[PDB]
Ligand binder design. Structure first.
Ligand code: SF4
Lengths: 512, 82, 189, 158, 48
């Protein structure tokens, strides 16, 4: 997992800096360890180690556990180190589903790691002062309404609570507080009525103490999976079918398990009554779509019963498999053309086959199929089974049967993507560090121009500062800017593939 | 005789990138974030060190900040910043 | 300007020196070894200051020269930024005026540091001067001149270590400022 | 299999240009018929029925315009249509030979009628690294590095 | 005047670490790649 290790490293550098990156990489390379050995191996001052570890545990990047003989073991979760890349995605979806107040709520919750109700609502109200002017005021009522709506919709989840000292282990406290998570109060928001008008940057006790909250990444991922499924169906059959899929996913979510291959049983009568009234559809029309969807050769949904006449269940894992297939065939077709995507999907359907059958079945011309078959064999996109003609398995006594392996595929495509995000960050940083000299040379003069502007200084500075050499370099600065922009957009997009890959490798993994 | 260029010619070239108001908004949000996590105590930069000489100016531009302290009930009683 | 820095090193003494008391021998050796050369990090070494501590003198096999380790301190030339200083001129240039400190000469006074009114000469490399009421563009700085007053504003070390398999500028640089009143030729003040 | 090779073998190549242009012609025409179906959105049972581009009628379309003067009757056309059914141009809708014209002949409507995919090119292939041949051979530390990768350079240069 | 470098590099062995070499590092060490099968030039100079 060296590529992943590097991704962790560069994310820590980007987001936290040097010492934090050092401690993080060391911990993910060493696993659970007590403080003293970590400080010894690193060799740095224990104050820096302590400070790093508390900032990481504040954002839940690391955890601490009481261990045998009373020592405290400290461990870091590698997966959580790959979530800040999706913070724009979380912010966008909450902005789509909630007003900018919810966007700011999620922003504060993420960037602070954890927050309490009073702290988060007060901070959001205070920061929103930059958004409203001309005497407009902000009261915690609407902020609290948006947060409780978020929590009810499962997007915001409560942090584990500390145990009660007077109720457990009286006397000298243990080395670590050993926090305990409670599920019945998971989305049970604390109650408050305080309101405070935001201070508009004029430059002139907690009722919910200990009730910390954090963003529900699982809910975000589930929402992303729903969006992907809805999009898949939209391209597949029709917008009406897509809206039906958007619908039965909605009642599915409120009751289905995130890991189950199949949703809870859903009838057409409940779909119709919960179906939006803005579409001119009857119950019989809905039944027709559901019956013809269940008859889909891709088996996207299955009947699975007959209660209420219309009875259907979506196959999440099978849909994810189709998603994983489509993305893999996407890469193949741009890397090798339609014919390569043709030869493979032939092999996907024909589980076992050899060159002559492939050529016959696709008229891939002689001296073309074989060479291409050798090439994408070299890419590990195809596995050779090689049955014997004799128990020696000699090359003259074997048949070269071809065989697919989707799971291994999804894995080392994902590794490809991991190396992808890394070497982009390498170039973005390489460009940033090479241009830093001109950047600071332009920023200092820009600050000079921007400074003492409201003071009423004379206008003989705008033109007199621009005669410098950076003026015929602004186009190069914009060249760098669009280059970083163009890099970033691809990074954003790559994260969109990553979701499909990670979702399928997760679902196919049984976790036993 | 001669090993090739380090950079062989390839017929297939990277698929063109997307653009749109949503993508631009996400890029702006990404720029905002990369500008944001530099401005709070969680961004633990290296402490200031190795003063050169006893300059008089130090009385004014000294950086002052609060000793950040989380909810200590939630952490072991072993890393007090004092 | 002068800085005293702590130093440790190991030295070899050939046998014919055994007649002398060891401290003076090690002192003169350390001086010849250090004196009149510059360090990439702390500036120009002048001469040893004092020898503080001495270890035991070993006699390694395969040689007859006693080896020993010293703790000592030395005086180094290392002016700090914004330091005032007086030094002779050594030559004019389009990029500024070169100033000599007698034992050191890599000081430049660029035209940005020079007074605004005078920006170039009458094609003669001798830098000229210009003011408002008096000094009608007739005063000029002699390549030798007096020990003009100036304040350093920049300094840099440049490494000149060998590169590649085996088989000219000074490695230590400074920049001065002369714009402010009272700076430059004392005849003006 | 020799001189025969399927009668498309002509010129001893499977006549690659003619087989690919014949496949493209077949695809486009049956798109046109399935497009009549989709434009009409005929009471969807009949929409999908007209989207069963009858491949007996495809076979009678491909004998004409002087395309398949070479051996055409089922076997050869049906198998070239099958070479198009191999790949993602198509998905399972033959309903055996009995439902449809000999099963719309190997199901030469199946889901050619609607090859419509469900996703745009992966952000990876959009990026240089994605297509960059020396992708894993871009050992930054070594010669090939993102900070010089001519592909990255070019991709970003434009 | 010139910047000072140490004049002696005398040192003694203390330990030997065994291991293998990674291919990118193996290429970094190597001066060049050999690519021609044959040994000497066709001409009567017997040059490599
Ligand atoms: S060579 Fe450059 S563009 Fe290609 S994969 Fe490596 S880093 Fe990416």
């Amino acid at each position: 997992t060296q590529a992943e290790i590097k991704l962790c490293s560069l994310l820590l550098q980007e987001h936290f800096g040097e010492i934090v990156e050092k401690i993080g990489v060391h911990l993910i390379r060493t696993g659970s360890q007590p403080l003293r050995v970590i400080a010894h191996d690193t060799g740095t001052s224990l104050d820096q180690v302590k400070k790093a570890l508390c900032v990481l545990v504040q954002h839940n990047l690391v955890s601490y556990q009481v261990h045998k003989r009373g020592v405290v073991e400290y461990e870091a979760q590698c997966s959580r180190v790959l979530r800040m890349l999706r913070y724009p995605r979380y912010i966008y979806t909450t902005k789509t589903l909630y007003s900018d107040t919810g966007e700011l709520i999620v922003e504060e919750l993420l960037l602070n790691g954890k927050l309490t109700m009073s702290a988060v609502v007060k901070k959001v109200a205070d920061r929103l002062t930059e958004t409203m002017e001309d005497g407009k005021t902000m009261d915690y009522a609407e902020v609290s309404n948006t947060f409780v709506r978020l929590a009810d919709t499962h997007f915001v989840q409560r942090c584990p609570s500390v145990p009660t000292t007077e109720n457990s282990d009286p006397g000298p406290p243990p080395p670590a507080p050993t926090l305990v998570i409670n599920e019945k109060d998971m989305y049970l928001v604390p109650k408050l009525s305080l309101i405070g008008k935001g201070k508009r940057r004029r430059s002139s006790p907690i009722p919910d103490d200990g009730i910390y909250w954090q963003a529900n990444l699982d809910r975000f991922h589930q929402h992303f999976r729903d969006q992907a499924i809805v999009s898949a169906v939209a391209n597949r059959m029709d917008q009406t079918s897509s809206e039906i899929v958007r619908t039965m996913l909605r009642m599915s979510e409120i009751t289905t398990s995130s890991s189950a291959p199949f949703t809870q049983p859903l009838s057409s009568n409940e779909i119709f009554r919960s179906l939006p009234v803005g579409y001119n559809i009857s119950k019989q029309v809905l039944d027709q779509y559901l019956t013809l969807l269940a008859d889909d050769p891709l088996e996207f949904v299955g009947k699975s019963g007959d209660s209420g006449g219309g009875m259907y269940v979506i196959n999440l894992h099978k849909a994810l498999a189709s998603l994983a297939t489509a993305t893999l065939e996407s890469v193949v077709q741009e890397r090798f053309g339609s014919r390569c995507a043709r030869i493979f999907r032939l092999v996907l359907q024909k589980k076992h086959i050899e060159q002559k059958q492939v050529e016959d079945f696709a008229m891939i011309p002689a001296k073309e199929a074989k060479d291409m078959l050798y090439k994408m064999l070299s890419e590990n996109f195809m596995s050779l089974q090689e049955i014997p003609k004799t128990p020696d398995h000699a090359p003259s006594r074997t048949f070269y049967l071809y065989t697919v392996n989707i799971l291994s595929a999804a894995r080392m495509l994902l590794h490809r993507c991991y190396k992808s995000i890394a070497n982009l960050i390498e170039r973005r940083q390489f460009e940033t560090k090479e241009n830093k000299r001109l950047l600071e040379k332009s920023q200092r003069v820009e600050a000079i121009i921007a400074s003492m502007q409201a003071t009423g200084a004379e206008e003989a500075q705008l033109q007199e500062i621009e005669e410098m050499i950076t003026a015929p370099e602004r186009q190069q600065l914009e060249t760098l800017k669009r280059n970083v922009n163009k890099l970033d957009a691809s990074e954003i997009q790559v994260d969109e593939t990553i979701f499909l890959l990670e979702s399928y490798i997760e679902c196919t993994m049984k976790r036993q | 005789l001669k090993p090739p260029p380090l950079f062989p010619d390839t017929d297939y070239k990277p698929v063109p990138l997307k653009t749109g108001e949503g993508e631009e908004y996400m890029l702006a949000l990404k720029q905002e974030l990369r500008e944001t996590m530099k401005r709070m105590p969680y961004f633990i930069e290296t402490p200031e060190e190795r003063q050169d000489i006893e300059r008089y100016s130090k009385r004014y531009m000294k950086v002052y900040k609060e000793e950040w302290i989380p909810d200590w009930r939630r952490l072991p009683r072993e890393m007090m910043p004092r | 300007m002068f800085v005293l820095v702590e130093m440790v090193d190991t030295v070899r003494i050939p046998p014919w020196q055994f007649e002398r008391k060891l401290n003076d021998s090690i002192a003169e050796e350390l001086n010849k070894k250090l004196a009149n050369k510059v360090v990439y990090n702390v500036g120009l070494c002048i001469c040893l200051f004092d020898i503080t501590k001495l270890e035991d003198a070993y006699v390694f096999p395969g040689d007859g020269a006693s080896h020993t380790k010293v703790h000592f301190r030395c005086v180094v030339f290392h002016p700090f930024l914004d330091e005032i200083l007086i030094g002779k001129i050594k030559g004019c240039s389009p990029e500024g005026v070169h100033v000599s400190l007698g034992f050191f000469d890599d000081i430049l006074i660029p035209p940005e540091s020079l007074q605004q009114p005078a920006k170039f000469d009458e094609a003669e490399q001798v830098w000229v001067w210009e003011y408002e009421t008096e000094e009608g563009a007739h005063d000029l700085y002699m390549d030798t001149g007096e020990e003009i007053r100036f304040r350093v504003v920049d300094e840099s070390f440049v490494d000149t270590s060998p590169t590649g398999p085996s088989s000219k500028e000074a490695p230590y640089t400074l920049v001065g400022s002369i714009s402010e009143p009272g700076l430059g030729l004392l005849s003006w003040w | 299999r020799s001189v025969t090779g399927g009668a498309w073998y002509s010129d001893q190549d499977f006549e690659s240009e003619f087989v690919e242009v014949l496949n493209q012609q077949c695809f486009k025409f049956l798109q046109s018929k399935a497009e009549t179906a989709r434009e009409s959105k005929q009471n969807p049972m009949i929409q999908r029925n007209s989207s069963f581009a009858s491949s007996h009628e495809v076979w009678k379309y491909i004998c004409e315009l002087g395309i398949s003067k070479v051996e055409l009757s089922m076997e050869d056309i049906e198998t070239i249509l099958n070479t198009l059914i191999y790949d993602g141009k198509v998905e399972m809708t033959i309903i055996a030979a009995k439902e449809g014209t000999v099963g719309s002949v190997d199901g030469h409507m199946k889901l050619y009628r609607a090859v419509n995919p469900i996703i745009p090119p992966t952000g990876l292939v959009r990026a240089p690294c994605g297509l960059c041949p020396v992708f894993d051979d871009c050992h930054e530390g070594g010669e090939i590095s993102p900070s010089n990768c001519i592909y990255m350079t070019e991709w970003l240069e434009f | 005047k010139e910047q000072f470098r140490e004049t002696d590099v005398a040192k003694k062995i203390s330990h030997i670490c065994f291991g293998m070499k990674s291919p990118e590092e193996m290429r970094q060490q190597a001066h060049i790649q050999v690519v021609s099968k044959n040994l000497y030039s066709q001409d009567n100079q017997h040059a490599p």
